[model samples]
Target: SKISDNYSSLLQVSEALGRAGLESSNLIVGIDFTKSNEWTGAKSFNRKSLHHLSNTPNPYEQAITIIGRTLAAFDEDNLIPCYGFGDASTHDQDVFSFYPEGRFCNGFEEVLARYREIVPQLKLAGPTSFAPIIEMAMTVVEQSSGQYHVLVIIADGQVTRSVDTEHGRLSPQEQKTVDAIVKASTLPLSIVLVGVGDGPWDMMQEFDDNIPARAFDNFQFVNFTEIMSKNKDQSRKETEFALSALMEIPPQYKATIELNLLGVRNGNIPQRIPLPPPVQ
Candidate 1:
């Protein structure tokens, strides 16, 4: 029963992603390439990294692929924006590159597959952080007027060194972060987070579980370990996983309109008293 419970929500959410069977939403595929995910890479001469498991996909790749594909259906023109953080080669230090590789793709499928093509070329560094990426998303929304934005942040449960430790699981900035989210409620923005790995995923619940309390119900978090570890086939498990991650977006989109971020109102077209049909 627990497994099928979310299936209904999945269908409900599918409508939000599509308008006229074509999705008009915009997406930002954010990847975490920090050294912490070293498990995804191979060492010397084809030596298997932890990511070489038989049935499961690489966590980072899996997250991006599923999320990208799901969101692609709603995106018109299907070209989504993509960015990566925590790359040592970038100039931003820990916060890392803004769209680490350039922008615009045919779709999420094309974009995500591109990561695998290039990952082997880069060195995975450390200290994963998301606040910088949040700021970046804010800037994009600030510039675009009517477009809604979805940021898919895929990470490995390493959210700042302070709260990531084994002893303490609370983010000192949780209050501050919530404050920012409330402020952002006035904009067309939503964030979906996926935490994958054996790391401390409990910290994720603290952020996702308290959605009812925030002024903006625009954030969601998912743990791959909990969902994928179930005794179900990969296809079914992944479908449920995608459903869990996506079902909340529609409400967040509605929040933006309700808050009048774009100055929209309900019902009817207006007819003027006819201004004399252009004076040539």
Candidate 2:
């Protein structure tokens, strides 16, 4: 009895992701462009950079190409939103936005092409921030209310350094970013972090631990090194890596979004499927 109930709940969320359609299920990709990732002899700056030009399908490009397309497959419309953080600040230093004002593509392939074309404009310097992008993703998810959104942050796993008299790291600031996940857990959304290269990623564990007591699931973290190895089962493993992080989405979506859709606003939260809305 218990096992069947659990499987049913999971099924509800999977059905929701597919039923939400293109308009209601949104996917966004965030690229880490901190200065530490600056390209050599290419006019290095103080911003964040997620990839270098030295490799075929650099880390940044590889993420967008593989995972970006993977997520788009579930997208009812096949379009995914993309953004870059810690790279360039056109207006305010506290926020990050579309790389060039209106940077969205119909699919991951177009996104790759657009990112490549912006090589000259991509700034590789920053204080290593995640809040800006998290806020960017949250705002959209919050506004829609009906749509399910996912934000994928591909980073090199380095924390921010203080530029002033603090002479410290961005631990406190980082805490605030993690807190956003807890605050927005009630919304239909999820956050996925992908660590690139050999950068230190242990600090990322905070996101998984610091969640609301009422929340059952939310964010996922994946280290590229653990997946992108030169093994005989490379392709099979790559798909598995992406799926591992996403395995939680079904449970998460059902717990937050589907519960609401089922009219379980203030009750014991029945363990059954929600009835259709008044049969039109």
Candidate 3:
């Protein structure tokens, strides 16, 4: 029930990184399956079908694989760990885990097999929430001592539960998940959401949370949509911005919210800034 195929972009980026004479490390990138859900997609389901991508005509599987492979290629024995959240190595647990220390891939097999192997065996049902996925990424990085943990989630951008759900706003379960993610996120963890398919994206907008800069505790998001008439490359810019969010800011600098500036909390710390303010 999420979104796209990520073949070209990620592969291209991998090839181009060397040209920049730079590499990334001390980071963690993850896809959340860390918890148990009521739904599960059998690993053998058709790859390029609309049903697989929650009903849109994009090569979702290829996109997902491209992301995994590109990162896997860069995943040497560093503190940066790559992880998966769903269909992980269990049945009852919702948030699943994959990858070896700073390395993520299905043994660097062909991209498709790599995807299959990386996806956990658990079912694909329920409690699909981005906040928890973000939280788990931070926790994994925290325990690993990674200086910067970057979480890249490629999905349909559908958070299974919402503020208007029947339970009213969010169920206790959902609230707990969100809270935990926000609390554990005092460190250098960033979440980037890559939307992979077509139509009906009103819900995903909540990710913006009207918080101005991004999601929670310095969270930022890059949303990709198959707009009817928008430029395809628009998503590319968002992707770059999202990648930038995965860095560490000096604690003294980050913690000090300018009164001339307003925090995501809507608290104005500064009066000198114009309508636009600098954000973390």
Best by lDDT: 1
Q: How many Å off is the CA of 275 in candidate 1?
A: 50
Q: lDDT per residue, candidate 1, 144-216, as tens digits?
A: 6547787777877565456335655444444344544555555677787887776566555656655344556
Write model 2 residue lDDT over 1-280, tens digit each, in one string: 0001222332454564566432345687776767766532122212233465534666677777777645675565766666666655511124444433434577878878766765446566676767666666666565454367777888776656444625424455565665555555655667778777665565565564444442545677776656765464856656665565565665566665555732222222112211111111
10 residues in a row with least lDDT, candidate 3: 271-280
lDDT of all predictions: 0.58, 0.57, 0.39
Candidate 1 regions exceeding 4 Å error are: 1-7, 15-23, 39-57, 90-101, 163-183, 211-214, 263-280
Residue-level lDDT of model 3, residues 108-198, one tens digit each, is 3433343454443333544455544555565554554533444666655445555457644754544554554444345444455555444
For every model in order, what is the number of clashing pairs?
2, 13, 39
Assess every candidate by TM-score: 0.72, 0.72, 0.52
Clashes of 1: 2
lDDT of 2 at 84: 68
How displaced is residue 184 in candidate 1, in Å?
3.6
